[PDB]
Amino acid sequence: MKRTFQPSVLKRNRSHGFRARMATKNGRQVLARRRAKGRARLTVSK
Amino acid sequence: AVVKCKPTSPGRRHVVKVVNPELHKGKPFAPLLEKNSKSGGRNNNGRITTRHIGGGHKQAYRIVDFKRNKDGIPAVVERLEYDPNRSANIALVLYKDGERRYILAPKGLKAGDQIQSGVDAAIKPGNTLPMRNIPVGSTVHNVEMKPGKGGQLARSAGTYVQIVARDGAYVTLRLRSGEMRKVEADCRATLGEVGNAEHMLRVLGKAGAARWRGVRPTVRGTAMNPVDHPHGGGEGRNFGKHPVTPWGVQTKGKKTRSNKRTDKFIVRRRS
RNA sequence: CGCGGGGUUGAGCAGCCUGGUAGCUCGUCGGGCUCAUAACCCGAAGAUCGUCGGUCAAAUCCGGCCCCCGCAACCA
RNA sequence: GGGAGGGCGCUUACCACUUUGUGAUUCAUGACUGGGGUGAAGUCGUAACAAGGUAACCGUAGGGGAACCUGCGGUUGGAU
């Protein structure tokens, strides 16, 4: 059975990447929540 | 000619092909080709706005000259060609100065014939000259709406337009739909009647014969569910409703025209 | 065996619609035209309202009864 | 001493009886059904024979309980 996670680095950084967060007003507030909470690694960008 | 395929397969029984040997069987003229990308019915927002569109075969748009703005300068018809973007074969046209274009094909055009446009051109099938110079009671095609716009009326396969009367600065036309219009007497109108008239006499034969044309299947509203289509519902083929488009508007009778700005150009509504 | 609609001169159909008031078409009878029968014309007769019971009065208002025509008897 | 040759036995070839599988044709028989014929004062009508009371008929098409009726063309084997 073909599972629901077929990983792909290029599609992960194009969608949940940092520069994906910065390009939209709603995404920019997503980071400001993570920084305020005090998260170690913010988005996904390994 | 219309040729009926022999029933060697259940799905080739009812195939009638309109085949024209005279169509050139090489490659189209290279400098007149551009890229043509499908949409599948999707627009800016990415949602479908016209249904049953998608798939098909990759095609290339050919730059058909609709305006026909070359006064003087006779030309010859080099060859006839098959245009997938339309219903009427096109013709490659070579002018005396060495310029090549594409034009639509009147029914009485072969390879090697000679045409020319302008207000002084002769009255023969293929020439373009303003409807002011065109004699009344004639049968024309590729008609315009505004002087120099390019031409919209009577462009499909086998259709034409009758010129009924010439009143002052306006000319009255009877269209192929039965409606009567008035257009400004300075519109150009290529003289003739569009070719490939056997385009009715064809039956695609099978489902794939339409699927490979950019036509996706349509699903009747009586099969849908009540939340998808107004007809919907029913335990065993019940209707009980006045026929309606999926958006609630009435079909099957309801007039839905409103311009109020070009109504001054209509003589008799189609009937 | 719960709920409707109905029983009218020989046939079909009104009058029951707020209680005095019985009609229409066909049909039966007696004459008339015809050689004669149909057809047509002129005249007549025929029901007390399904039954048994309950106000000055009853086809009508009410109940039982007899018969007919209908609908509804479902969830497991 | 045996040899040549022959018979018996075995074996192959041809073929009768017989057994299969599919057809063709012919003869009876079959619930029900189509038309036809005959029969007694039956029922509904009156199509045709006269100008048969809408002249008849031929081909074709549609309709009707039935004779039949109507459209289109054709003939005189129609009266005045």
Add this chain to the structure above:
RNA sequence: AAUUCCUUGUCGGGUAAGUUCCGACCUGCACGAAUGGCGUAAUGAUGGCCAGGCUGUCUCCACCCGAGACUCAGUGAAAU
């Protein structure tokens, strides 16, 4: 009848025996003409019935070969 309650309607075929099946009757509770009618060769992992071959499906089970099930050594769950 994918439609017919009474109904296993009645007659015929098939079977020793046929509420199913095929043909016919019409008494259509409650078929019927593009929410289409009646036919139709080919097609179908579609619904119903019949026949030939075939067989442990069955009368009625018997034997045999392998993995388990049982004993010894190691590790060692779960529902309640």
Add this chain to the structure above:
RNA sequence: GCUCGCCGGAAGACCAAGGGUUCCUGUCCAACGUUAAUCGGGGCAGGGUGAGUCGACCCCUAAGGCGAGGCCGAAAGGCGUAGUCGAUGGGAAACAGGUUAAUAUUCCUGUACUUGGUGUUACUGCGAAGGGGGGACGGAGAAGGCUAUGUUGGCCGGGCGACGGUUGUCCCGGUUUAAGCGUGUAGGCUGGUUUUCCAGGCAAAUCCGGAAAAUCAAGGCUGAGGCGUGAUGACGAGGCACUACGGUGCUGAAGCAACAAAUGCCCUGCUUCCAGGAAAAGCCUCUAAGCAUCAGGUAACAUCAAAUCGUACCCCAAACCGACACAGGUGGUCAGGUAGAGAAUACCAAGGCGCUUGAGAGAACUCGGGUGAAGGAACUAGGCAAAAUGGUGCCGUAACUUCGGGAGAAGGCACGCUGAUAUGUAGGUGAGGUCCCUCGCGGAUGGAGCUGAAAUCAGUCGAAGAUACCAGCUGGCUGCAACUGUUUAUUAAAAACACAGCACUGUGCAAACACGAAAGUGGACGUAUACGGUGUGACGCCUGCCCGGUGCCGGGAGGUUAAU
């Protein structure tokens, strides 16, 4: 170490995606390993990835994203022009061998090639954002020439048999060599050269386009393979010795022909068909402004530079997605022998594994299989399941029909081995000879060797010769749906949905309709033979009566009637 067994279109070998030390040594068995463990993809420590040519980077674009100004929108914001990003596509160059415990088209040896800067010369009109050319494109089918590759023969090296034979038509092994450079074949496309003129290629143009005239029957482009050369080199069985006994060092013969042959190459080719089959850059050419000293361009010569990042390892799995060392999922590339039409199946080679609990016993009962007396659907909701047929050639084959079908209908016959026809035929292949020759990678003639079906006759063995795996069950009547297709991922695959066809109706282009507070966009770079909605569902014969009710269309007199 010796046997046995299994996969062998894979359970073998190599990649992209993905993972991130899992790779190699030494060392340890507390924990992880469904058991023990000296073992491990475990703990600890050390080691390991070498690039002008392979990729990424880089130049160019598709779908599409972002979008200076801008248009639009209560604010956020939406769309979009010039531009600029985006490969799953286009653009320069390296091959053979040797070596490490671990890397190698990356190091070493040998032999190459590509693009830039600079310098020396010899020539020279150079010059772009613009003109043109090319890059540049589909599906099917058919042969023809080849190669990889395999079989056989020769040659070389070795051998004379554990038990009857085996100095011979006997047995085993080897018979390999690249990129590059020259040559230009089988073939495939196109006529070339020159001269004069021109309303077109937004300006110009000697280039494309077009119009004329002469001339010659030739020229040019493309092109797999073959043959030289690289290579009197490397490789090479096996012998010689050290053996730390893991392997290491020395030497080294033959290294040729025939036949068969691809799904790979010529082939982006040829023929044919309708459903008519990406864009831009690299590259060639023409000129404008501009420079005519220069500058710049063409060719040879010498030198310099080619930076940065990946390079271990698993990659159909114990290292990826499934919570696990999980009977699941995962795109591409290579394709040996025998029998076979085959990438099916059966047995094998190269290679890799025996699937991380065993040892006993031989009860019931369950799971997976084998055979069965006589009967053959009597069981059952129902022939569910088992059983059965199963190949090639030939004979033969009905009702019905849209003339194609039905049909592989049904039902039958032959099939192994040896010999003769023929000391292997028909056919395919084709060496020396021989002649001609535009003399070459030629053309005829020429049949040595090689390979090789199919058939007939006769004999022969078994119970059985498509002997194994592989491999149709067949007829009769009937409802529904014309047919191939699609559907409830995970209880419903159908009579449901779709379909080609038919009908009604809307729609005159700034179209109807749809997404959207709007701008705008799909419809469509389409124009009534077109497009949208609705119903029916191939084909044949058909589609009767009702406009009272509910809608819809037309009407414009009369009545009723809102804001003002």
Add this chain to the structure above:
RNA sequence: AGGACCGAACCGACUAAUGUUGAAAAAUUAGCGGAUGACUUGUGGCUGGGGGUGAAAGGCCAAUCAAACCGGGAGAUAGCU
């Protein structure tokens, strides 16, 4: 030539059996349908919740769908256990 025929790769899922605290949160075994097309597959894009998409089953939208997931209104309300 064929939405032509038989049949492996490939795609699918008609029947029976086992499994139902499985090897597997839908598979294995023996059979089965399509296999030049309305086919199948790799990479990258687009459409977003009363919205998408749908050869139409209320199917599918991260093991969830007659209206997803996460946070907030929120200690909603509960004549009910």
Add this chain to the structure above:
RNA sequence: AAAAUGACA
């Protein structure tokens, strides 16, 4: 304008 029918011997 309407205008039908009449066993057999």
